[PDB]
């Protein structure tokens, strides 16, 4: 007739609050003979002895649930994990309260862990809603944390699956390095201007400082971050015009503990309605109703709590979390909008962009300049080295028509032959005439270069990694270094599956060359 509940807490005030909530749990549940005894454990700087003592005390206690409520740990590791693993050794449900890392979202390893604060991946859905509001498609996502970057980008891909659009650029690396300006300049050259960052305080500060250094914070740049990027020294270097996200009651442990204890009480009373009552042993036999009790918990529905409608998903996370929106207006946090469980409502306050007007800057750009690529075609593209220095001999045809050439840069020989020999040469012929006619027709410049090797391009998986990859003209076009391939390309389904074509200018087939 007794149910034990374990928890890890340091502050005596919260321990008394937990005891009071435990006492009140039996108030409106009638005069049933169910008894609730409260037990909590304190903090120790280490983790091996902490985990050992916690496991021993909880085994001797035969608890049903475990609560951890340490947001401000001096160690930045945020590791209540060993308690969750030891609880999963007997399939004992664990409900997190503070940490929002997506590592706990993985039930394949965290077999007996839940939490009521959604991870930052929901901020990806919030940003998708923002994109719906402001009609933005191409983004430039930069991530540093590989543990969640894959998960965050997976969430973004799932969101875009409705739109069937793509993030124009993604970036991932080892946090700690600082020579990131090359990738920043790579992103700056593109057309999209909406930049979304997701990292810790150090990397957020580093990228804000670099963007200010390279003047990536001018007009038209719309930024978008979460909560961790506008905290600590990252807030000190924060460039004005940024928009940030705020979690409602993020650290209000007083109400969070009350909501958790109420949920626990109602869930325990729901379980006691059914048969097959099992209790943990004193730690090689698992608790047989572990998954059964977790299934009982999954279907739980509540109408109580200051936060509101508390409900769990298949991942045991929180649903319909209301979010606050903050704008860095002259280095002061001004609320500019609110977020419902499914809709965003801006408040009466105005939002100022890093540049001028308060209207949304269209995050798109155009570039007449087009990097053209091709291969050395014997009758269509004639390649000639310069005469003396960067000059093309202005030879004429036999029909009074001057020969029009183009200054082309490419390797001299193959890699085994030429280690590194790339010189500006003179290119002309048939394709050059076609492209020059095109440039005459529509106003846009170009910059011709050559393919590093002599292949059209094949999809070859890595020799050992077996990672399919293209090369040649297709490889240089897929990599983004090429904007338009103008070459005697063979129209076929395999290549049309990856890129687009215009109507054919040529009609011919294949033959056999003999002597």
């Amino acid at each position, epitope marked *: 007739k007794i149910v034990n509940i374990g928890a890890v807490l340091s502050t005596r005030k919260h321990e008394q609050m937990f005891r009071e909530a435990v006492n009140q749990a039996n108030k409106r549940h009638g005069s049933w003979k169910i008894q609730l005894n409260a037990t909590s454990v304190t903090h120790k700087p280490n983790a091996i002895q902490m985990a050992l003592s916690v496991c021993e005390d909880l085994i001797s206690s035969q608890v049903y649930a475990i609560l951890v409520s340490h947001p401000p740990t001096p160690n930045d590791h945020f590791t209540p994990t060993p308690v969750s693993y030891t609880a999963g050794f007997y399939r004992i449900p664990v409900l997190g309260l503070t940490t929002r890392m997506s590592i706990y979202s993985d039930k394949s390893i965290h077999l007996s862990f839940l939490r009521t604060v959604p991870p930052y991946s929901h901020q990806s859905s919030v940003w998708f809603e923002m994109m719906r509001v402001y009609n933005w498609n191409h983004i430039i996502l930069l991530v540093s944390d590989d543990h969640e970057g894959r998960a965050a980008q997976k969430r973004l891909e799932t969101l875009l699956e409705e739109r069937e659009s793509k993030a124009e650029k993604v970036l991932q690396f080892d946090p700690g390095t600082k020579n990131v300006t090359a990738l920043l300049m790579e992103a700056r050259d593109l057309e999209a201007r909406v930049i979304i960052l997701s990292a810790s305080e150090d990397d957020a500060a580093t990228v804000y400082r670099a963007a200010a250094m390279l003047n990536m914070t001018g007009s038209g740049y719309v930024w978008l971050v979460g909560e961790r990027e506008i905290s600590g020294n990252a807030l000190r270097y924060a460039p004005d015009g940024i928009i940030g996200l705020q979690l409602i009651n993020g*650290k209000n*442990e007083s109400a969070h503990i009350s909501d958790a204890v109420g949920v626990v009480a109602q869930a325990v009373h729901e379980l006691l309605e059914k048969e097959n009552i099992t209790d943990p042993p004193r730690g090689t036999n698992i608790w047989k109703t572990g998954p059964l009790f977790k299934r009982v918990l999954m279907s739980s529905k509540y109408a109580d709590g200051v936060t509101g409608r508390v409900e769990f998903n298949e991942d045991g996370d929180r649903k319909f979390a209301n979010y606050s929106i903050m704008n860095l207006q*002259n*280095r*002061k*946090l001004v*609320q500019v909008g609110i977020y419902n469980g499914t809709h965003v409502i801006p408040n009466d306050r105005k939002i100022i962009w890093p540049g001028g007007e308060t209207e949304k800057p269209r995050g798109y750009q155009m570039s007449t300049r087009l990097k053209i690529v091709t291969i050395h075609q014997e009758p269509f593209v004639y390649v000639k080295p310069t005469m003396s220095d960067g000059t093309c001999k202005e030879e004429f045809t036999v029909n009074g028509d001057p020969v029009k050439k183009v200054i082309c840069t490419g390797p001299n020989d193959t890699s085994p032959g030429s280690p590194r020999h790339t010189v500006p040469q003179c290119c002309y012929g048939f394709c050059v005439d076609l492209l020059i006619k095109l440039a005459r027709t529509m106003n846009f410049t170009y910059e011709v270069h050559l393919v590093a090797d002599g292949k059209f391009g094949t999809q070859e998986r890595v020799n050992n990694s077996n990672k399919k990859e293209w090369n040649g003209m297709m490889g240089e076009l897929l990599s983004g270094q090429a904007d338009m391939i103008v070459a005697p390309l063979t129209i076929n389904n395999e290549r049309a599956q990856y890129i687009e074509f215009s109507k054919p200018f040529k009609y011919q087939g294949l033959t056999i060359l003999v002597k």
Partner: antibody, heavy 119, light 114 residues
Framework: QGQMQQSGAELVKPGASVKLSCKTS????????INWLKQKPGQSLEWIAW????????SYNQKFTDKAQLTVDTSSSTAYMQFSSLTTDDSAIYYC???????????????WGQGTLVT | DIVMTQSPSSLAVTAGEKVTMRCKSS????????????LSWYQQKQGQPPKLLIY???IRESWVPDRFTGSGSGTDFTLTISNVHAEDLAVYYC???????????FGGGTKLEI
């Protein structure tokens, strides 16, 4: 109406450290800004630092950047200022005040503590 | 630090008269984008925390009677009392509130005598 209550008077040996407390109530503790000001007797108040409770953003006076540290407790809505390496120059009255912001525009310090004298 | 110049340093008047106190900043407290002056007038009486009197160099607080009148813009500002009362006797300070112009500084102050 919001109330800010400070700690009692302190006698600290020179070179030692003191940590003052400032309990706040009657308003949104998380979404406001609190400032610590140093006021010697018969002298005007000297701004020391400000901190935002919602983001833990800290900014100190250059004269006190290496001398004072600020912390907050969301559970208690109480501000903290720890003054270390205390010297006789620190014999003064320290005050904690809540910023008044109207229409998102700062309008001055509207709320005050009772004051604390450190000897 | 923006130098805040207050004039006069002190004055004594009879009840019922009209007074004028000026505030001059070394730099323009007006931000062009929003056209607002980051100036705040305060009333500081003996033994009490200062009470926010006028912000934005023109807007009175809800508790401030209509007799107080703040004027001036840019670098020069003025606090004017149309009908001076004995209760108004205090030392009034003007302080800038421009976040981009940190740190916050105060003028020399004006002592009101009756």
């Amino acid at each position: 109406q919001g109330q800010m209550q400070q700690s009692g008077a302190e006698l600290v040996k020179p070179g030692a450290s003191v940590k003052l407390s400032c309990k706040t109530s009657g308003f949104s503790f998380s979404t406001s800004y609190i400032n610590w000001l140093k006021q010697k007797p018969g002298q005007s108040l000297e701004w020391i630092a400000w901190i935002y409770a919602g983001t833990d953003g800290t900014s100190y006076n250059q004269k006190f950047t290496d001398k004072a540290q600020l912390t907050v407790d969301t559970s208690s809505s109480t501000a903290y200022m720890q003054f270390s390496s205390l010297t006789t120059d620190d014999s003064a009255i320290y005050y904690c005040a809540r910023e008044g912001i109207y229409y998102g525009n700062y309008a001055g310090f509207t709320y005050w503590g009772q004051g604390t004298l450190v000897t | 630090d923006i130098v805040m110049t207050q004039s006069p340093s002190s004055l004594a008047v009879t009840a019922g008269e009209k007074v004028t106190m000026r505030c001059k900043s070394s730099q323009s407290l007006l931000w062009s984008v929003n056209q607002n002056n980051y100036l705040s007038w305060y009333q500081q009486k003996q033994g009490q925390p200062p009470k926010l009197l006028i912000y934005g160099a023109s807007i009175r607080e809800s508790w401030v009677p209509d007799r107080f009148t703040g004027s001036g813009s840019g670098t020069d500002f003025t606090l004017t009392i149309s009908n001076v009362h004995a209760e108004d006797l205090a030392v009034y300070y003007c302080q800038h509130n421009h976040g981009s112009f940190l740190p916050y500084t105060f003028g020399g102050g004006t002592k009101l005598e009756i």
